[PDB]
Amino acid sequence: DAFVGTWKLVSSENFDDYMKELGVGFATRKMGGMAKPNCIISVNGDVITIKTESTLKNTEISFILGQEFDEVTADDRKVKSTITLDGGVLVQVQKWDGKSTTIKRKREDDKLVVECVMKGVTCTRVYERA
Ligand SMILES: O=C(O)c1ccccc1NC(=O)N1CCc2ccccc21
């Protein structure tokens, strides 16, 4: 849809603070912060696939909107994820150990804008088409 494509990170705001709030350690935050991932989004019927690729870590999820799934995150959290489409926004919640974080993926002009919230910390990651 609006989301399908190959996208490259072009800017990041507050990612270090977000990783800290998630409980990511210093060494991993150091490696993660200077990464410039690509994100490849595809759809085949009910099933959406999001691949996030980088030099030091690749992840992939495939899901059906509204259907909870188990996910191991890039930082090795074992979470329950649910992704829904709300007003053109892909809204992902990840739940684990009584905590949650929300990851919203939105299309804005030429950008794929990713807003990540954990407690008081909001991180914005901006991607453009490769
Ligand atoms: O990066 C993002 O914008 C991102 C945004 C929302 C949710 C997950 C994310 N990131 C992610 O899944 N990965 C995978 C591998 C890797 C290496 C370095 C930094 C990040 C990531």
Side-chain angles (χ1 to χ4, degrees):
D1 27 27
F3 294 97
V4 166
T6 297
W7 300 93
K8 171 72 179 179
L9 187 76
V10 299
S11 72
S12 183
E13 189 178 340
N14 303 333
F15 190 58
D16 185 60
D17 290 338
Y18 176 73
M19 289 185 289
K20 201 162 171 80
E21 215 59 30
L22 293 170
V24 184
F26 182 83
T28 305
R29 290 203 324 277
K30 178 197 81 273
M31 290 186 292
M34 294 249 338
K36 289 280 197 179
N38 299 316
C39 182
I40 306 171
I41 300 174
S42 58
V43 177
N44 262 142
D46 277 323
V47 186
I48 304 164
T49 300
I50 303 176
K51 294 181 182 191
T52 311
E53 296 177 359
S54 78
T55 313
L56 307 164
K57 181 59 159 183
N58 306 314
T59 60
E60 181 182 310
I61 61 174
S62 288
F63 60 89
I64 297 174
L65 298 167
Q67 182 184 301
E68 191 169 67
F69 61 103
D70 293 311
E71 173 181 7
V72 181
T73 67
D75 62 308
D76 306 311
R77 291 174 286 120
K78 283 64 174 182
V79 308
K80 304 286 197 174
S81 287
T82 311
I83 306 181
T84 59
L85 190 68
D86 186 354
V89 182
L90 283 164
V91 181
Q92 177 173 14
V93 60
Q94 297 176 334
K95 303 182 183 194
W96 76 107
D97 289 331
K99 300 180 266 217
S100 73
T101 185
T102 296
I103 299 136
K104 295 176 176 188
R105 298 171 170 95
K106 308 170 170 188
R107 287 279 287 104
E108 303 182 14
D109 296 340
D110 286 330
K111 302 167 205 185
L112 165 70
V113 181
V114 191
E115 179 201 62
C116 307
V117 174
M118 174 67 176
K119 302 187 190 162
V121 173
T122 309
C123 159
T124 301
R125 309 271 283 179
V126 180
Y127 293 75
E128 285 187 12
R129 283 185 198 274

